[PDB]
Structure 1
Amino acid sequence: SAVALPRVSGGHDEHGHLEEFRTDPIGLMQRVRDELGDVGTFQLAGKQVVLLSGSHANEFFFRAGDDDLDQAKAYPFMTPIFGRRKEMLHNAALRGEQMKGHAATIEDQVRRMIADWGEAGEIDLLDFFAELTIYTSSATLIGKKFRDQLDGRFAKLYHELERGTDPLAYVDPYLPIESFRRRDEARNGLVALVADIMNGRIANPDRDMLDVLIAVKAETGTPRFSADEITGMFISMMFAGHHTSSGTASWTLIELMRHRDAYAAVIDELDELYGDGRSVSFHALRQIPQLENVLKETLRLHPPLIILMRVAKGEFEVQGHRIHEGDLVAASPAISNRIPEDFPDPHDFVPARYEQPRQEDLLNRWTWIPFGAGRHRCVGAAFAIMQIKAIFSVLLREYEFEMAQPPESYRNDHSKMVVQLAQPAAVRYRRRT
């Protein structure tokens, strides 16, 4: 007896539109908007997703209180990965007064990663940036000491965790599928790496977070936290900022290479700015215009999170369409960031959009959403931007990059809820001079 909301075409497979969502989620979300407008739905297994788009619908979505649109249970694929607390996990390291030190830490991690590059060579962006950001994340959020005890193994296993986010999780996150199996196995591997580090510290003692948790005794003198508990906490702290920063660093370089005029502009800028003799820790926290605009455009075109989920906790009305409790409600940066009315020539790379005269990011407060908006806006935004500035201030002044494959061959893999750059993503480098 209730009015059914508009539903997008297709979705006749076993789990509705889920199968298409696993193969081409952006095409699906775009068809929802093309056929229905600002409010439309698609079937995700046994759930109905009310996909909102456009300034009006997005405003409702982002300004909604935690009591109206709940985020907590919107991402089922995360529970098996982790194994209020949101503030704790990040807040601490994101304090402005700590940014300078983090920038210096990031610079050091980058230099360490490129220490063996030599005069010239070739890298794969996913392998490089995924590993690099594991080191930047662990160093800044857990401690340099802890990072120094990590190698490529931790990175490989963390990546397996991320790949264990198939949309099938919306059916059941524990289904006996290979990606879920590899996910659980990788988490056990991570717990083992942590246990090994804990043991090593026992035998032979700049203290970090692990030293703190390790010293915490219960009452009988027995350690309070197990390797599993600690690893779960560490995984939690590093997740929000890993795939996002990794992917964004990859696309920033790709777009720079695809657009040599912007690349040249950034180079000139970097050389001039650093001509003042100040460190990356100083400049990564201050204006670097051209690079910043290249980053903003890269994020508009390649938002690491293409869909944002919520669970309706009540009935609401958006444009005459009624949302019911239990309804999954979503917004899409992938789609919204390319609305033609809001962003002239939305498929074109135009950093100038963000220059003082245009400022399309600030003008479209509800549709330029790579970092989300409203109360749930990305709390790591300032940090992520600082990181890009620090990373490229190093890379672009030390090396020159060129695509080793067709410009159009670089693409993302959208088969999992966590988007990852697809491979190969081969790039050649050569020392600058």
Structure 2
Amino acid sequence: KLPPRVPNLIPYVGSFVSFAKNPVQFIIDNSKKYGDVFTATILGKEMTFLNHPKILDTFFKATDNELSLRDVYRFMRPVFGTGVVYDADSTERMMEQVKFVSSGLTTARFRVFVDIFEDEIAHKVKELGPEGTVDVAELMADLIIFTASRCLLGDEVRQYLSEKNLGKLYHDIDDGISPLSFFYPSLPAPKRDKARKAVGEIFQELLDKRREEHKKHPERLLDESKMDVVDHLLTQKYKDGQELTDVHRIGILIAGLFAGQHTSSITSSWTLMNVISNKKVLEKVRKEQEEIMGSDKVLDYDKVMKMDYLEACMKEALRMYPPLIMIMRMARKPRECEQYIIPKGNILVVSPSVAGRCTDTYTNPDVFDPERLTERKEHEKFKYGAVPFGAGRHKCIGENFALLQVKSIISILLRYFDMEYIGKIPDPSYTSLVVGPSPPTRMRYKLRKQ
């Protein structure tokens, strides 16, 4: 029959209050009370939490006409744009648009991306000086504004960042997104909308300029190392032959940038903080760096590909502090889950955060221990033991780019600086759509070469 329910505090509002304090502890506590599968009413939505790795196969492999992503993420429409990704006309159109972004994330582009990271960090160290203190979360966000933008859109974007305040516009859009919008997609957000329109105008101009650059220098279209997402959007069509609109191209780029920034800056923050705060982990990370770097003075792709221990450190931060804490779908048909049937219209929920603290999978889950993955392989105990990037048909298409960006940034920063974190590693703050550490996140730095 139906899964057990979390008793409602009030009708309609349901369990919103305990939920919004800490959605992760809400799921944990209620798992303990009600088991692997339970339902809560939350601001009018029937939400059915799936809380053990064991049962997740049917969730991750269902077709979009059974478990719809578009029904639950459509709320992002005022950020991304009408007709884009989860507001696309169909599952099919969404998948095609996602492929246009994946199409600028090639090996050839990754070799160039390393150079971009080196270049932006070198600019940034001029601000930072020989020593100081800096907020970790801000530093990473600031770096990734410039790196993600240039990686996805090309170098032509940088003059807008440097001269037309584009980075402030991003913040205006992105602080304009409340997680509450998931329940109330029509919440007014006029500052967000003003900024989104401004970025729209700038990106329209970037498209217009690229078009005539394609005329002046069509060889660009033949060089895989110089082809970016803007180039692919300007020269591709849907499979059925329908051309894209410039409004669709703008929205895809904004969606791509949004994806390319927040989850990465947050992950590089939690990763760096935990690395520099743990003497044994820092030793190993630096020993690995010194071996891979050898006599060379700058990074390249092949070097990053060898940073296995640093990668493990990132995965361990992803276990502990996954930035997307809830993966959702709407049930378009009733769904069997173990002994239960989950009603049509219910929203099924999987939490990477809950999974990462599951003590059936992880021993001492509150401890940052990259060796739990590299030596003890604790993630491998279940097919869905670790799902920070999703799984199945909708698994993150950005995973390798995020790995590259975060490993590269943390590698280059280490090369430049000794760094120590000030204070206790914070708790996550659940006030934002993409979850990051509670501010402030400060560290001291000092340059390693006079």
Structure 1 and Structure 2 fold alike (TM over 0.5): yes
- The letter for the 2-side match of 1:315 is P
Q: Take 1:322 and 1:200, find their aligned partners in 2: how far apart are those partners?
A: 54
1:412 is aligned, of 428, 432, 437, to 428
Structure 2 match to 1:221: none
Q: Take 2:286 and 2:263, find their aligned partners in 1: how far apart are those partners?
A: 24
- The letter for the 2-side match of 1:358 is R
Q: Take 1:203 and 1:282, find their aligned partners in 2: how far apart are those partners?
A: 31
Q: Take 1:12 and 1:167, find their aligned partners in 2: how far apart are those partners?
A: 21
Q: Take 2:29 and 2:366, find their aligned partners in 1: how far apart are those partners?
A: 17
Q: Report the alpha carbon displacement of residue 136 of structure 1 after superposing the two structures with TM.
A: 1.4
Q: Take 2:289 and 2:432, find their aligned partners in 1: how far apart are those partners?
A: 36
Structure 1 match to 2:443: 427
Structure 2 match to 1:378: 396
CA deviation profile, 1:232-264 (whole Å, cap 9, x unmatched): 332112122211101001101111122122012
Count of residue correspondences: 417
Q: Which runs of 5+ in 2 are unaligned?
A: 82-94, 221-227, 237-243
Q: Report the alpha carbon displacement of residue 171 of structure 1 after superposing the two structures with TM.
A: 3.4
CA deviation profile, 1:144-171 (whole Å, cap 9, x unmatched): 1223431393233323333333233233
Q: Take 2:4 and 2:190, find their aligned partners in 1: how far apart are those partners?
A: 37
Q: 1:297 to 1:333 in 2, by over 3 A?
A: same
Q: Does 1:93 find its partner at 2:111?
A: no
Q: Report the alpha carbon displacement of residue 40 of structure 1 after superposing the two structures with TM.
A: 0.9
Instruction: Please list, as runs of the form range in 1=range in 2, the aligned pairs for 1:143-182 lying within 5 A after superposition.
Output: 143-151=154-162, 153-176=165-188, 180-182=189-191
Q: Taking structure 1 as the reference length, what is the TM-score of the superposition?
A: 0.87
Q: Report the alpha carbon displacement of residue 267 of structure 1 after superposing the two structures with TM.
A: 1.2
2:125 is aligned, of 111, 114, 124, to 114
1:188 is aligned, of 175, 197, 206, to 197
1:319 is aligned, of 329, 338, 358, to 338
CA contact (8 A) 2:276 2:419 kept: yes
CA contact (8 A) 2:39 2:49 kept: yes
Instruction: Please list, as runs of the form range in 1=range in 2, the aligned pairs for 1:117-136 lying within 5 A after superposition.
Output: 117-136=128-147
The residue matched to 1:334 in structure 2 has which SS? helix
Instruction: Please list, as runs of the form range in 1=range in 2, the aligned pairs for 1:4-15 lying within 5 A after superposition.
Output: 4-9=2-7, 11-12=9-10, 15=13
CA deviation profile, 1:324-372 (whole Å, cap 9, x unmatched): 22211110000011110111111111111122x4222334321211111
- The letter for the 1-side match of 2:36 is D
Structure 1 match to 2:259: 240
Instruction: Please list, as runs of the form range in 1=range in 2, the aligned pairs for 1:78-89 lying within 5 A after superposition.
Output: 78-83=76-81, 84-89=95-100
Q: Take 2:409 and 2:23, find their aligned partners in 1: how far apart are those partners?
A: 30
1:367 is aligned, of 375, 381, 385, to 385
The residue matched to 1:430 in structure 2 has which SS? strand
The residue matched to 2:47 in structure 1 has which SS? strand
Say what the alpha-carbon RMSD is for the aligned residues.
2.9
Percent identical pairs in the alignment equals: 30
CA contact (8 A) 1:94 1:383 kept: yes
Instruction: Please list, as runs of the form range in 1=range in 2, the aligned pairs for 1:199-278 lying within 5 A after superposition.
Output: 231-275=250-294, 277=296
Q: Report the alpha carbon displacement of residue 4 of structure 1 after superposing the two structures with TM.
A: 4.0
The residue matched to 2:126 in structure 1 has which SS? coil
Q: Take 1:369 and 1:215, find their aligned partners in 2: how far apart are those partners?
A: 34
Structure 1 match to 2:301: 282
Q: Report the alpha carbon displacement of residue 203 of structure 1 after superposing the two structures with TM.
A: 12
CA contact (8 A) 1:399 1:429 kept: yes
Q: Report the alpha carbon displacement of residue 10 of structure 1 after superposing the two structures with TM.
A: 5.4
CA contact (8 A) 2:104 2:152 kept: yes
Q: Report the alpha carbon displacement of residue 285 of structure 1 after superposing the two structures with TM.
A: 4.1
CA contact (8 A) 2:101 2:229 kept: no
Q: 1:58 to 1:198 in 2, by over 3 A?
A: closer
- The letter for the 2-side match of 1:300 is R
Q: 1:254 to 1:72 in 2, by over 3 A?
A: same
